[PDB]
Design an enzyme around this catalytic site. Structure first.
Site, PDB file in Angstrom:
ATOM      1  N   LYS A 144       0.861  -1.159   0.000  1.00  0.00           N
ATOM      2  CA  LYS A 144       0.000   0.000   0.000  1.00  0.00           C
ATOM      3  C   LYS A 144       0.923   1.242   0.000  1.00  0.00           C
ATOM      4  O   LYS A 144       1.784   1.404   0.889  1.00  0.00           O
ATOM      5  CB  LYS A 144      -0.858   0.054   1.237  1.00  0.00           C
ATOM      6  N   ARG A 153     -10.711  10.447   1.520  1.00  0.00           N
ATOM      7  CA  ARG A 153     -10.656  11.192   2.758  1.00  0.00           C
ATOM      8  C   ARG A 153     -11.881  12.137   2.907  1.00  0.00           C
ATOM      9  O   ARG A 153     -12.402  12.336   4.027  1.00  0.00           O
ATOM     10  CB  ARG A 153      -9.298  11.881   2.871  1.00  0.00           C
ATOM     11  N   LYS A 172       2.217  10.231   5.219  1.00  0.00           N
ATOM     12  CA  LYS A 172       2.257   8.868   5.660  1.00  0.00           C
ATOM     13  C   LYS A 172       3.464   8.143   5.103  1.00  0.00           C
ATOM     14  O   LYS A 172       3.479   6.917   5.048  1.00  0.00           O
ATOM     15  CB  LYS A 172       0.967   8.242   5.153  1.00  0.00           C
ATOM     16  N   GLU A 216       7.396  -7.006   1.142  1.00  0.00           N
ATOM     17  CA  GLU A 216       6.150  -6.743   1.943  1.00  0.00           C
ATOM     18  C   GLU A 216       5.193  -7.940   1.875  1.00  0.00           C
ATOM     19  O   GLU A 216       4.704  -8.433   2.864  1.00  0.00           O
ATOM     20  CB  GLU A 216       5.520  -5.488   1.486  1.00  0.00           C
ATOM     21  N   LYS A 249      -2.416  -1.575  -3.379  1.00  0.00           N
ATOM     22  CA  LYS A 249      -3.236  -0.354  -3.349  1.00  0.00           C
ATOM     23  C   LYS A 249      -2.273   0.841  -3.490  1.00  0.00           C
ATOM     24  O   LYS A 249      -1.252   0.897  -2.761  1.00  0.00           O
ATOM     25  CB  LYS A 249      -3.931  -0.213  -1.977  1.00  0.00           C
ATOM     26  N   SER A 254     -10.328   5.579  -4.631  1.00  0.00           N
ATOM     27  CA  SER A 254     -11.250   6.681  -4.790  1.00  0.00           C
ATOM     28  C   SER A 254     -10.816   7.622  -5.884  1.00  0.00           C
ATOM     29  O   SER A 254     -11.631   8.026  -6.681  1.00  0.00           O
ATOM     30  CB  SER A 254     -11.380   7.428  -3.466  1.00  0.00           C
ATOM     31  N   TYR A 266     -15.190   0.910  -6.788  1.00  0.00           N
ATOM     32  CA  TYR A 266     -16.471   1.646  -6.609  1.00  0.00           C
ATOM     33  C   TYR A 266     -17.343   1.466  -7.826  1.00  0.00           C
ATOM     34  O   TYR A 266     -18.527   1.829  -7.798  1.00  0.00           O
ATOM     35  CB  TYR A 266     -16.181   3.124  -6.364  1.00  0.00           C
TER      36      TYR A 266
HETATM   37 MG   LIG Z   1       4.139  -4.964   5.800  1.00  0.00          MG
HETATM   38 ZN   LIG Z   2      -5.527   3.749   7.585  1.00  0.00          ZN
END
Ligand SMILES: [Mg+2]
Ligand SMILES: [Zn+2]
Ligand SMILES: [Cl-]
Ligand SMILES: [Cl-]
Ligand SMILES: [Cl-]
Ligand SMILES: [Cl-]
Ligand SMILES: [Cl-]
Ligand SMILES: [Cl-]
Ligand SMILES: [Mg+2]
Ligand SMILES: [Mg+2]
Ligand SMILES: [Mg+2]
Ligand SMILES: [Mg+2]
Ligand SMILES: [Mg+2]
Ligand SMILES: [Mg+2]
Ligand SMILES: [Mg+2]
Ligand SMILES: [Mg+2]
Ligand SMILES: [Mg+2]
Ligand SMILES: [Mg+2]
Ligand SMILES: [Mg+2]
Ligand SMILES: [Mg+2]
Ligand SMILES: [Mg+2]
Ligand SMILES: [Mg+2]
Ligand SMILES: [Mg+2]
Ligand SMILES: [Mg+2]
Ligand SMILES: [Mg+2]
Ligand SMILES: [Mg+2]
Ligand SMILES: [Mg+2]
Ligand SMILES: [Mg+2]
Ligand SMILES: [Zn+2]
Ligand SMILES: [Zn+2]
Ligand SMILES: [Zn+2]
Ligand SMILES: [Zn+2]
Ligand SMILES: [Zn+2]
Lengths: 329, 323, 329, 323, 329, 323
Positions: free
Chosen positions: B200, B210, B217, B233, B248, B274, B312
């Site tokens: 992600k 949001r 982040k 990952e 994602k 989104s 969506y």
């Molecule tokens: Mg991880």
């Molecule tokens: Zn989160």
């Protein structure tokens, strides 16, 4: 490093929705090609005892039945003429007769159903007195390059009739390239060639030879000098590589279930459009068991899903209508 | 295979629809479609979202109304995203594990009413924190890894207790899949699936979500530049016990989908986020792109190797596929 | 055997410096190629509603704007002429007119900015009344080899105008080899051919067809008999392999974001110079969202970084100037 | 792909700068450059090093002066190498873990002043031992593995306490990465990176560094002949928890860089060591090679797959790149 | 699953015997090829300041020094003539002069030392006034195919002189095939061609251009239109594949240390006889450091072992005698 | 690479010795040679072995005499095989771990006298059992796995105590490498190497060694038919801590050598066993084969990927190589 109990492979199997989410392969009617046995004459329908539920059909009857195959969305038919005994010869000349069953049937179907794919069979076996796929020499051996000359003529006749796909099922060396060069030279730019690339010398073909009427001709003859030894897998890769180099648009493995390992290797190795024939003996085995109540009818979709799983793009199957009906529901 | 023009003309199979169908490598089906849905606290309420044209936040009763058609269309699962009332946000994110939080209530309602429908809950603190980060902050504003996991574990257990078949940790803490899985196993939730958001990215494509849920982040979400890192990952999440793994955003990361599927041969999902939805729908509504770009976008994911797609567009796609 | 907590993948993400140290891909202005729409006439500038922020420019105006593109260090432009309606024909002869917009623009830019790369578009679509990429037969089908003959003439005209790169976007079979053999025969030894190898039959092209004025011509026509099916991935490898064998210097995938998996497979498989086109619909989607305040402008560099990550050597992008400006800062 | 002259002429893309730029496979940037720096004990002092023309040992205040320009140039990190006063060397190497040792002091100074600058400390006993070996010696003169690790662990913790973002064990003891990582985790230093010198060879190319810091090793450093062995070294360090892995020396071992990157797809670094610098600079100053060989040498590392490069040329390179 | 402390990689390093047992690569004198600079005239020896310890030698002096190289077991020499200024021209005709330095030296050495391999340099750079590797067109560009014609003549002259190996160092496209077809046609069946396949546009060549006297000719000229970009690795594989297809017996990477990753990829990919040139700048760097006391003389064998480790079959190195002497002890 | 005659003539490089030398893929050196030697209990004694023409069982003093030349020739290591007096054999194989057994005595003697010479001891019960099996038998005549390991562990520790640098378990019990390694580590023998006989086959080629040492096995030694199985054997031994791995017999199993080297890239050895030696020497003495077949046989092992070769030809080969 996936290990129980952190990894429990049953979790995704717990519910239908999750099985659907992780399902790797889904058969659709776009996968199904219907072989059909074509008789000469008018208003003729004949059962085949060793293929329960399949009928040989004259062209008029074929056109009627095809309305339903088209409605079901079956993409293509593979035609197999039932050659009259009197039209069999040493020279196989009927193979290239513009008024042969295959050529007539192709022109009729191309006219009636312009979107339906027609795959004609390029082989001398329906046309020889001895039932072999090619022309024999004086030792009884199927001559490679002389047979190709006839096959070429046949393929051209099919292109002339309007077939979108010609499928050489003969297992002569080099015939894909010879056919392709003839098609190109003649301006049949877009006629597809669906090579039977890895076609095995199998016991699974018996019912078909009954259906087309070549069983009597072949008798106890065998085809081990041209069809592949069942034992051989690596060899299939060499066969397919040559046919792709020679210009095949699609490649096929035959028979089907008994050779699913071949399907997977061929798809993995070449990443090309790969087809598989669920042959007459396969259909007969499954039908027989279903009609005896030994196997549930669900076996039909399971058998077909196997081909999809093994990497097939499409499947020649006598179950195509049955399966199309089930899928649509 | 020494294929060469004119012996090989790749256009031959393209000549006719029937041959295109025969050689077609991938077919999207409704089985591929998972619908994200924004869930409000009230009753008899829907809200429109400025940056997600066409998408309505739905109170639970309205969710249950719409779920009738989703189920009728064959959509296999929903992914729930609660729209937390601002009064319920806190620094400790305790609302995450509230047994009568939106997600928990929605789950129980849907489980009881549509027992075959898959419900994928979101395991993350971001809807519950006053600051909107996916974890608990230290005094320097850093998202604490292991402290955050403890909360996420309680969250995930609360979802299992509510009946969710799948919990989907979207937090990007290190090690959280293993912690969650060990908690589920110890509690006896042995068949609750974990759908890890494994790769992600720290992306600009999340802006509209949001707006939807009412919430940088780069110290936890991945750098968009990195591909190899995604494999590490995913590897860890599989070892830690994930049943499914997810990339994602989605279309901007199709390369990652393909590498992940090729490397691990495991159940692989992708989120058409989104911003991807908004871009597409905006262009469609402006008349700049044809509606056909919806199924083309979703076919891309299948082609890249996705098992399923959070999108969506799920209902519109399912409708088109059924025609 | 990397396992939490010994391995915490967040550690390298903790600080900017470490993110920079482990960052796998960095976009630079050497990655950006700017497509540009060229009008006939003088002192002409036209907005395109479905490509906000992009203008069609007459040659004089193009030369003015190019000063800034060159200053920003954009390596190359890809030219797309906006053919007057009256110059469209069945024979596409305007394609090879030495006084066509593309040829005039090329000569002007080669003169003015000798270091700037010029990539001309080799295709009949701007020149046909029906908007298809090639010449139609009497069934309405785009003929392969007759179209190549015209494409060849076009490519030669471009080489004659001084274009360093010709980019055939037509999706005819074999055209790379035909063009290359013509260039070699004519002594255009060093004219690069940037093949559109894996070019898909996509919905993402609509704005471009508005920008160049071919939307009206094409109408509801489709290109499924030559452009690739969106569903197909392995097929792209076969397309690229042929074009490399035929002498392409660079190969391209189009569209771009929706096909990033194709970019990665093509780079991984062939290890050749690989390009990707972020097409008009992609630009329009992103712009529209940015101007609505739905997405931050950072999405532009994120979208471009994706191509770099997927293995692209360069990117045809309408964002090239915007991006060059941001990178330089 | 059956590419054949004259259909394929590989010179076409070489014809023009623009096409060379389009097809260029690798681009060095300042993000790739880590500057090693020799740190003295005093104040207002610099020293020249006979065998490293152009490189100055710097007291900490002088380090902080120069760091202004390094930061301005965008150099992401420094690798510190203390020049230990001879009076502080011992058989037990205790100076390694002295909270007011050079490395610790330098780290704290730099952390506070240039908070964004990465500081990579050297974890090794060699600057602290009277004999100059990288570990503690037994009675036969053998470098003890596990005894040495205990010291290195205390060292690494002292660096974490000083604020280093990265500790880089250069000792070539077996198992030291795991021991260090388990000590950092247990102490709560959960984000301190470990840059392992994984494949560090027993090389003649280190001569000038020993002049610089004021200090045979075939029983711990690798045999230059061995390539496969490097993969086993790296594998262990990744499993043990390294965040980054390093090959040293650098250009003489470019093959190893490429194999390591190809095999593990992990963050891979390379050290262009003192002897490599000295050879190059000497030849440049003699007029035998053009200055262009600096960026060519560094481009080699990027091409071989390096994520970053420890190089005494970092400032000169950063300058050239900025032009 | 190898893990400390069960696996301690130091155990095999504990003792010389075990290091010898597990040692992966051992350099031998069979790995060393000595480049040598050849002067015209008699009794001439000239130092080269930028290559300390290397002398340019007239043919008589070369034959004397070669007694020792042969005694040391050095398998081959690579000859580089130091062309008199007056014999440089636009047409490079000296390249194919039977009485040129290279041809004379080859005949002398073939006679005197029949078992010693002689590798001649096939390139126009020693013979052009401008120092480029080929013939220039009117834009100052090195023409590919016209240069090959001269290279061919040169290669044939070398074969005629008795060279067992010709090594084209020119980086023209296609020259390996052109040279091979000429050699075959002329009956030089067994003349080896050692292609400089991946030869980079490098700064590391400066001392050699001093040694052969081409530095003044080249001046500030560059070779980026034919030699490879330092940044490129995958491209080297494409270069090598073409030269193997074109009939090279050996392939070479140049320069050497700075390109060891290329050596390894080329060996891994093709499994063919692979050579590497430790060029003049590499020798100079190491010598300079050794004579300053900055590096121990052990660096020489370490540098050479690296090539062996990276997969080289043999190494062109100015250290060949030094190294042979050390190995023999 | 589309190489085709006559553009490609593979004979060109074969035309001359110099070009053959340039393109030669593998060169055997004395570094590759490990000499097995049969060690007697007495003093001033040698014995000839009927089925190993040319090979002498040697008392320890005679071993030390011959070792002078072996060391002079550069032979890196010996592999000792004791010839146990019949009175010392038993069902419990206790002689295996006798501190004054032949192997232990020989080791100490050689360690002290030729400190640089590697000594590889044999860890197996077969020279010590009355029945000649490689392990302890149960009542059904089956070789007990885990019971046998306990003895082998004591054996291996006794060899470490005697000073052996390498212990080589030739027993083919499952798990014995790990048990031995855990015992060596626990005892502090942290640098004693373990040379596992990983893929050791149930072979007819061992007949002459049984004559030499004075001693069926299909329930522990591998079936000659099996290749894939060898990879699983090796994998386990590496995980268990082997420093080197070995295939035995040798030339009949060159395929296994190559697969093992290719799969694991680890230090790989091969044993040219007694029967291979005997066949070759017999044919050489009969005049049927030239002496050149010795170096050809050993070149085969290097070509197949062996790091080193246990061969009774080691001295003759070393002599020929030195010429
Ligand atoms: Mg991880
Ligand atoms: Zn989160
Ligand atoms: Cl499917
Ligand atoms: Cl046609
Ligand atoms: Cl990059
Ligand atoms: Cl040109
Ligand atoms: Cl070697
Ligand atoms: Cl010859
Ligand atoms: Mg065949
Ligand atoms: Mg498939
Ligand atoms: Mg299909
Ligand atoms: Mg209501
Ligand atoms: Mg799949
Ligand atoms: Mg699916
Ligand atoms: Mg194509
Ligand atoms: Mg790349
Ligand atoms: Mg680029
Ligand atoms: Mg001061
Ligand atoms: Mg290590
Ligand atoms: Mg990389
Ligand atoms: Mg970097
Ligand atoms: Mg070349
Ligand atoms: Mg080799
Ligand atoms: Mg060699
Ligand atoms: Mg005596
Ligand atoms: Mg075992
Ligand atoms: Mg080896
Ligand atoms: Mg060896
Ligand atoms: Zn037949
Ligand atoms: Zn077009
Ligand atoms: Zn050290
Ligand atoms: Zn040259
Ligand atoms: Zn035994």
């Amino acid at each position: 490093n996936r290990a129980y109990p952190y990894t429990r492979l049953r979790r995704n199997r717990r519910d239908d929705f999750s099985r659907r989410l992780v399902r790797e392969n889904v058969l659709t009617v776009d996968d199904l090609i219907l072989p059909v046995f074509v008789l000469d004459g008018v208003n003729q329908r004949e059962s085949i005892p060793s293929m329960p539920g399949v009928e040989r059909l004259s062209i008029d009857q074929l056109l009627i039945e095809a309305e339903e195959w088209v409605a079901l969305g079956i993409p293509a038919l593979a035609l197999f003429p039932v050659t009259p005994v009197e039209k069999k010869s040493l020279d196989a000349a009927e193979a290239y007769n513009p008024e042969g069953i295959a050529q007539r049937a192709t022109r009729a179907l191309r006219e009636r159903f312009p979107e339906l794919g027609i795959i004609t069979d390029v082989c001398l076996d329906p046309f020889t007195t001895h039932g072999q796929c090619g022309i024999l020499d004086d030792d009884g051996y199927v001559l490679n390059d002389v047979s190709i000359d006839v096959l070429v003529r046949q393929a051209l006749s099919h292109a002339e009739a309007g077939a979108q796909v010609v499928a050489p099922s003969d297992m002569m060396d080099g015939r894909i390239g010879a056919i392709r060069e003839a098609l190109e030279s003649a301006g049949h730019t877009n006629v597809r060639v669906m090579a039977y690339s890895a076609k095995y010398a199998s016991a699974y073909y018996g019912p078909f030879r009954d259906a087309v009427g070549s069983a009597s001709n072949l008798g106890k003859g065998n085809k081990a000098t041209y069809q592949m030894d069942p034992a051989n897998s690596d060899e299939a890769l060499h066969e397919v590589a040559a046919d792709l180099a020679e210009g095949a648009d699609m490649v096929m493995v035959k028979p089907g279930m008994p050779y699913l390992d071949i399907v997977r290797r061929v798809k993995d190795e070449f990443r090309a459009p790969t087809f598989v024939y669920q042959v007459s003996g396969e259909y007969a085995m499954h039908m027989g068991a279903i009609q005896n109540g030994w196997l549930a009818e669900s076996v039909i979709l399971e058998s077909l899903t196997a081909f999809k799983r093994a990497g097939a793009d499409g499947i020649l199957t006598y179950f195509a209508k049955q399966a199309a009906e089930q899928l649509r529901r």
